[PDB]
Design a protein around this ligand. Structure first.
Ligand SMILES: *[C@@H](N[C@@H](C=C)C(=O)O)c1c(COP(=O)(O)O)cnc(C)c1O
Ligand SMILES: C/C=C(/N=C/c1c(COP(=O)(O)O)cnc(C)c1O)C(=O)O
Lengths: 428, 428
């Protein structure tokens, strides 16, 4: 047992196996695992014994990655997926089925919005979007078919910080879990939603968790704290005999691990959005420095917001740590280890000034990603949120003059100098 | 243009890029691809220009994998998935939505059956199973909500070969595509369903395509031969303005590549079951020997069926090249380059005779996989088909005494000798 993020990110969930004593995690580039005998195979498939069967469901490299992220977020267990989008999809598909709905903040990553608003309705799963952040609107949107409340721990790219505890209380009084996308909380370093009532946490490990922009992946973290038996009227599949496994009852067999066990033995087994062990190993190398990177990211982001605030060329600065931020009181309560790695800005001049400043950058990179160690910038109105209508973009805090900046871990003087010379060129 | 499988498996879909001139396919371990300028990023996201955006959707290593398989199967294009299960799920989820159904053969790999019988119904998508293989029963099952016919080119694990041409006509005359799971066809080497009417081909690339049991992966191959416009009454999303892309009309923009385009810009984008480049490079190493391996696999299987036919300890041999096989007339018609890499057997003795024989093998491995270069054996009643009810296993051809054998490319004498010594320990 360790308390400290900086120790867990190096040590949790792995012990050198006695056979090789390998200090680093091996890459188990295998699809299969040989049975000891026929009866052993029968027990593994019959869920009468834990053990490796097939890498669509489990892999010892992926397993270290799952346990470590679980330990950092404070959950009991995790399941890795092939992407952050798949982490969201498998979660929602386990909680809900045709005829159900979920309640969700309207401030979302554009891919999430399109998934909730376009894809899932094809399967009879609808989403009601709440724009205000007000507790009473979240409560009003819930009905008898609702199966979750869904929010981002810091919305991409306007950085709304939700009232985690208030929203969790509403969810729990209605008998539904709170699902938090904690991607912008950097693996639990900036924000730890399970400590504030979240029942399930999903991540795009592609971002800060991975940290180096090499690898797509996602992960689903189960708090173990939602009582599926007590709320079985909304979730009968969690307690009733399972058609997939000859009347197996998940709650009776697995208890607090019921949700994440279903994710694995039903959803990964049948949807098949599994993570490669090569990908897991790249994510593990990033996790080994997650706290150090997230610490420098937030320091650079703070200094860079100061420079932007006093710049004659900057119209506005959106940074969650600012006392003029619309949700500063939530940010102050929940972000006590740095106010994130992100800021957005609007620049002065005509409609083409935003592109001229980005295109003039020579150190910052213009691409679709966040949470690289390299500094990035993009115009989300035309990119990450392009699929939404203009009204849905504005309802998500995405404006047409906004430049989203993912602040890297380069020396902050070089980042500042890069904008400062790009400003000279577009203005004077 | 090359004709020959043996040449395509080494050359199709890749030319050394002029910058590095790398003869082998590089591993593009990157999440992102830097824009030339802001306008370029907007053109990419707007689907106005072809180009790398983000590895959840596209990756140059994965692109070679996709093009090479499409060329080997005779399709216009392909999309990779994280697993064979994901390939099937994304395909059906694009053809069907809540309220729709598909018609499928009852002779299915157990995970596919569970997908169709248990998972997809939760999304309002039901499956009607046909047990007889009779053209009339396939036709009687279709109704106005049907969206495809689904068959395996050689069913796992009784090796029923369908009447491809007859079934493809039933599908096309009712306005629906024939979707064929060609996993046991070995990437098109043994069977090329598109030559016999199939519109969409799915593989588990985990099997013979990869050929070394290192990597999970899937692929979807579009023939480009199904007129979505002519059948827009059953598939309106193929022609009607798309809510994901501001009214874009897919058929009008992409024509015969419409289905495979939606797989990428809708399903891989939103479900996110993508393949990593490390996985793709492993599978490309497989594909470079696929014809050589499949040829040796089938030579060994033929000789091994001969050995089993004349063994006193064997009760029955099930091999699609046998003139006694139930669908031998289909097999003789569609399998002209070797009768596959699989056989099944039942052994004399009590209930525990099959386990005695498998457990006594020292060269053949007892595990869950087919299509490894190493020879494999398993008991599908308690493993790959365990989730099915007894009646469902029997209607898929699976019985309790069945030993499924994936014949490897070891020297056939060592394979035979392995069975001999296990036969002598268990039968005196
Ligand atoms: C292969 N399924 C194997 C399970 C270990 C087996 O031993 O048969 C398979 C699949 C699933 O593909 P993934 O395992 O998700 O890549 C799909 N269709 C067929 C016909 C298979 O054999
Ligand atoms: C290019 C994509 C970026 N976003 C990703 C993302 C995902 C989706 O996660 P995968 O990309 O599927 O791993 C989920 N949740 C959040 C808050 C995200 O930011 C981007 O914003 O620029």
């Amino acid at each position: 047992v360790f308390q400290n993020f900086e120790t867990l990110q190096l040590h949790a969930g792995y012990t050198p196996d006695p056979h090789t004593r390998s200090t680093a995690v091996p890459i188990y580039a295998t699809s299969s695992y040989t049975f000891n005998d026929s009866a052993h195979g029968a027990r593994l498939f019959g869920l009468k014994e834990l053990g490796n069967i097939y890498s669509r469901l489990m892999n010892p490299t992926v397993d270290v990655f799952e346990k470590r992220i679980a330990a950092l977020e404070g959950g009991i267990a995790a399941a890795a997926t092939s992407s952050g989008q798949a982490a969201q999809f498998l979660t929602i598909a386990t909680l809900a089925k045709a005829g159900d709905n979920i309640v969700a903040s309207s401030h979302l990553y554009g891919g999430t919005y399109n998934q909730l608003n376009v894809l899932l309705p094809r399967f009879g799963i609808k989403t009601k979007f709440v724009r205000s952040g007000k507790l009473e609107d979240y409560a009003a949107a819930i009905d008898d078919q609702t199966r979750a409340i869904y929010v981002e721990s810091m919305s991409n790219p306007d950085y709304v910080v939700p009232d985690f505890e208030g929203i969790a209380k509403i969810a729990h009084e209605h008998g539904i879990p709170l699902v938090v996308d904690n991607t912008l909380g950097a693996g639990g370093y900036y924000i730890r939603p399970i400590e504030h009532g979240a029942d399930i946490v999903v991540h795009s490990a592609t971002k800060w968790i991975g940290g180096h922009g090499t690898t797509i992946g996602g992960v689903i973290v189960d708090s173990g704290r939602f009582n599926w038996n007590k709320h079985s009227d909304r979730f009968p599949e969690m307690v009733e005999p399972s058609p997939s496994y000859h009347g197996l009852k998940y709650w009776e067999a697995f208890g607090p691990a019921t949700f994440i066990t279903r994710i694995r033995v039903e959803m990964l087994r049948d949807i098949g959005a599994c993570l490669s062990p090569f990908s897991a190993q790249q994510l593990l190398l990033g996790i080994e420095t997650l706290g150090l990177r997230a610490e420098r990211h937030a320091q650079n982001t703070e200094k860079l917001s100061k420079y932007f605030e006093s710049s004659p060329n900057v119209s506005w600065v959106l940074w969650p740590g600012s006392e003029s931020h619309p949700t500063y009181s939530q940010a102050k309560k929940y972000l006590t280890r740095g106010f994130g790695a992100m800021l957005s800005i609007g620049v002065k001049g005509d409609a083409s000034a935003g592109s001229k400043v980005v295109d003039g950058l020579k150190l910052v990179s213009n691409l679709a990603n966040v949470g690289d160690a390299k500094s990035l910038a993009i115009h989300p109105w035309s990119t990450t949120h392009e699929q939404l209508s203009e009204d849905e973009r504005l309802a998500s805090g995405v404006t047409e003059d906004m430049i989203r900046i993912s602040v890297g871990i380069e020396h902050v003087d070089d980042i500042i100098a890069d904008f400062e010379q790009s400003f000279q060129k577009a203005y004077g």
